A paper describes a structure:
To address this, we determined the structures of all human CaMKII isozymes in their autoinhibited state. Importantly, whereas the crystallized constructs of the α and β isozymes contained the catalytic domain and the inhibitory region but only a part of the Ca2+/CaM binding motif, the constructs of both CaMKIIγ and CaMKIIδ additionally contained the entire regulatory region as well as a part of the unstructured linker to the association domain. However, the autoinhibitory helices in all isozymes were structured only up to residue 302. Different crystal forms were observed, containing one (CaMKIIγ), two (CaMKIIα and CaMKIIδ), or four molecules (CaMKIIβ) in the asymmetric unit. Similar to the C. elegans orthologue, the substrate binding site is blocked by the regulatory domain in all human CaMKIIs. The sequence flanking T307 represents a site that is incompatible with CaMKII consensus substrate requirements, raising the question as to how this regulatory phosphorylation site would be recognized as a kinase substrate. In the CaMKIIδ structure, T307 was bound to the substrate binding site and oriented in an identical fashion to that observed for T287 in the transphosphorylating complex. The T307-containing region adopts an unusual turn conformation not previously seen in kinase substrate complexes. This unusual binding mode was stabilized by hydrophobic interactions of the conserved residues I304 and L305 that bound inside a deep cavity formed by residues located in the P1 loop and in helix αG.
Author numbering: -1 to 0, 11 to 309
Amino acid sequence: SMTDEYQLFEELGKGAFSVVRRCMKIPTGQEYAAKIINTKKLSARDHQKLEREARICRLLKHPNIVRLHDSISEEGFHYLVFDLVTGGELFEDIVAREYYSEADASHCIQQILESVNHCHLNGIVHRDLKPENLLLASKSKGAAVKLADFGLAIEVQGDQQAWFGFAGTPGYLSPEVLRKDPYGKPVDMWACGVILYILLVGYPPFWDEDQHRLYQQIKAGAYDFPSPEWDTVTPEAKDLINKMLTINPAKRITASEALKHPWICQRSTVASMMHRQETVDCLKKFNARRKLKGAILTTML
Ligand SMILES: N#CCC1C=CC(=Nc2nc(Nc3cc(C4CC4)[nH]n3)c3ccccc3n2)C=C1
Ligand SMILES: [Cl-]
């Protein structure tokens, strides 16, 4: 069925137990990305996580989410056939731009928030919002940002919270997760705050090479807007970051709310248009740091 319906070509990239190869639908020649999961040695419990991801991805159909077209089961191998995206990471793209302002960062965050809101409307919490999962659909200057990798996503029932587990990437983890408290949709809005922060200045709000002091920072909500770099950032941008980086997740801004924040919905009159070279230079260093993997910026095993 799989080799009758698709033809696998080169490897695009990988995961901690999955390869992604470009593929073409037979006989139409249409391209997709196939995520290939070797299932021969998987536990039932691990296969159930694959079942969850396939199920969640089949539900989600949105301009800013990489669409799953097909979930094929064969003997020892499962295939998740996704839309192909050729623009790479949003964050790598930003560093190659000649001109980058708050209005650009707003444009990005707006798309990210539309995808998060669609997830949340459909009872899905992503739990690992991070630059790695934010890909441009194509290399076009106009390309949509698309949300990827639902390998850690959970299905919530309405606005009921639960102890879904300690899962995610340290630098982007929310206080309630770290606290071993019940959680839900708000954890994705904390993660967006962190991403927005890094989108404006190019370094993370919570940073310490000692994982323990990293978590104490997060739980205390101890981030600031230091000079000179934040001095040129609009009050409205900081206000949004503040509303997302609220320790009490009940009082944290929702995705829908964040889409009506003036910095987002009134971008053209509220977001600063000044080039932020120093951000592009910092993002360069940030991205380079991320490439090295290790403790803070890498999804927890
Ligand atoms: N899911 C998941 C994780 C994942 C793993 C590898 C990955 N790399 C990657 N992915 C892609 N493209 C891609 C990935 C997907 C689908 C989101 C898995 N659709 N398109 C390309 C395309 C061209 C050059 C290089 C590429 N690299 C992107 C995402
Ligand atoms: Cl479809």
